[PDB]
Symmetry: D2
Subunit: 232 residues, 4 copies
């Protein structure tokens, strides 16, 4: 349903691409981005259905302006990025990626996280290595390559809780910012500040993001957070 266009003439809008690709069916989003050396352009076109996108692909190797274009499935080029400074806008992200010679196809921003699409699988991985753990104005940056769609990877275990902290509302509100919570599970009657609880997120990326809560202050305790063991 998503498509990468490579090597369009630099003089190309979202509109110019939209008018070239209109005849393949309903388009939800069209994003345009400058090449590294600024001589050509990339495009991310997201479609309605599967065949809406497969029509675009049958327009690969075609000549536009004086550039032959490549059109292929945008697959596994997506990372998320969080714990950057509150003031950070979209440009700031694009700037980070520009610092390490990586094109940002698209950035979607609203404890806020951003989802980023790049132009190649290697770029997504390389981005993560270089930037994860970078400090910016006191904030340690956190990135991972997206983890697509079996509790495996979606379940976290929260440890070192007191009795006072073993409260379903608190845990909810302390974790919801990472993504949708499917279920919170607090094993019966833990009446040493060694209480725990399990939380299952809807998607893997939220569980990953939640791992930031590890070694963090919750109320008056340092909590521990990790991926739960998978059911035997």
């Amino acid at each position: 349903t998503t498509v990468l266009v490579k090597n369009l003439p630099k003089s190309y809008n979202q509109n110019k691409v939209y008018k070239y690709f209109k005849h393949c069916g309903p388009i939800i989003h069209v994003d345009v981005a400058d090449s590294l050396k600024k001589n050509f352009r990339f495009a991310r076109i997201e479609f309605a259905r599967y065949d809406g996108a497969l029509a675009a692909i049958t327009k690969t190797h075609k000549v536009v302006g004086q550039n032959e274009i490549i059109v292929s499935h945008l697959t596994e080029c997506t990372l998320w990025m969080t714990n950057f400074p509150p003031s950070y806008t979209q440009r700031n992200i694009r700037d980070l990626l520009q610092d390490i010679n990586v094109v940002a196809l698209s950035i979607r921003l609203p404890r806020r996280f951003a989802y980023i699409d790049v132009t190649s699988k290697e770029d997504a991985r390389y981005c993560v290595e270089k930037l994860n753990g970078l400090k910016i104005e006191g904030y340690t940056l956190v990135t991972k390559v997206s983890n697509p769609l079996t509790l495996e990877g979606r379940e976290i275990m929260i440890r070192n809780l007191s009795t006072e902290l073993l409260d379903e509302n608190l845990l909810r509100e302390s974790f919801e910012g990472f993504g949708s919570i499917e279920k919170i599970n607090i094993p019966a009657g833990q009446k040493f500040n060694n209480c725990c609880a399990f939380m299952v997120f809807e998607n893997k990326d939220s569980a990953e993001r939640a791992l930031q809560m590890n070694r963090s202050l919750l109320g008056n305790r340092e909590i521990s957070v990790s991926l739960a063991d998978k059911k035997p």
Copy 2:
């Protein structure tokens, strides 16, 4: 070219699996692993050519023994692991993965007979999620004083194959020395040492044949080389 077979009878060995699939095409590797609860076996079959694999897939939903099998493309289920104890055997690695309820489809490992320097193991698992999970659970684990390093494999233009080495002294700026210091991480394509350097801020660029090698080589960051602590990072990609 590689293929997954799920739900084989619990008594199927490499041979029986080979016997069954040999007629699909030339087969390069067969590996067979127990399921978690030990009631069936998985197998990994690597064909010489893509159509061997295609023909194996057509064997999906067939009955073998008393079992209905599933056959599918095995893709992105490869991780590497290293800096385990020198005495670790392939059983040890399998026991680890078991500790976190992961079936290891195959484990290839330089045998103890070889005493290989900077020894690393490739491990195949049964699902993409397993590889990601496995790296996350196991990385940084401490075994007999060694801190474990694992990453999902990264398959194949200099991007991610090139490392920069910093904090080198004049005496450490020796091509043979670096070659020797890093060659265990995987094949070296080129060692590149800018002239004029001879503040202990000497640097060297090393390019590896593949990205997984350049990744493992990052273990040399914060490590003692001769008499200095060098720093190793992935080279900034060229604009």
Copy 3:
């Protein structure tokens, strides 16, 4: 230079303490704190002169109210803390120490940092052991015991600099927040993005704080920062 008073009666105000000791010499500061279990008090009295403190020490084992008091030199009980949330007040810091059962003898709070005195050498170390790297609202806390008053431990080296970033002012601006700079030294004619600079802080604590700049975005590059090697 400074004195610890232990086992004062709980009713003992700062004023009352100041009154009891004011016949020892001029007093710069008086600070009072509750015991963990709130049944006596500690005081921190800083004097103008040494004999002033030695005078207060002769007051050791004397009976105030119905409490036998103990007076010693306050030595090696000082830590600095930094990279807490900007919203954090003095009371917030005291809460932290109470979460790990440590009395804050005094907290002084002006890239802000806090200086905290505690009631024992072990408390200082335990406190650092327990709180360093604790994530609070996305800020990973940094603490260290103070390092008392030649280049050793005061000189840092900044690496991975670019030609553009090799600016005396830009570095000064970027680092003076950690404490007084004595000397910035940029080795002539370095003009592959591996430039360096040396900076000498007036005191060691400041150098230690500056280590936070390691692995951090400066302008458009990740810099590395470490204690300089020491001259043979």
Copy 4:
């Protein structure tokens, strides 16, 4: 009751050092080490009785041969170091300190650990800061300044244990390499992979070393290890 002599003539061995000081009181140990540039010697002398050392300090500023010596209390100049390769000798350990231009006054090398004495308080802190986390042959080096000498900083908590691992004996066997164990406490009846044990060590250096067990494989589980909270 240990003393540090600085600027002895470079030709002084432990023998003629012993003779110069033998009249201060009985001596248990003499260690002699070369200055960085080999132009003088340090000695570490350990006297049997306090007044022995006290008498040696009055030798400070005396001329020996052609050198003005300095004599002082060797205090807070000790670190321990652990997780180096099994084949490391005293010589290898001297080599490390030399690499960072720190004189090793003495080294006691009996999971082994070494105690190392250096010639200034700064050098001990500096030495830990440079060396800690150094990777030698895949072993990440651990070092801390020693911690002199109720439970505070001597008690650890071990979490994430299973039913199988909750055994007085396997715990003793697993932790005794870090130093003498005073007590092992397992809170009754834990038969959620959340089991825990408390261990008290005779001394804080031992507890600190045992923190190494944190994030380590014990049997079939990754254990968690940390300093226990101090009891309210």
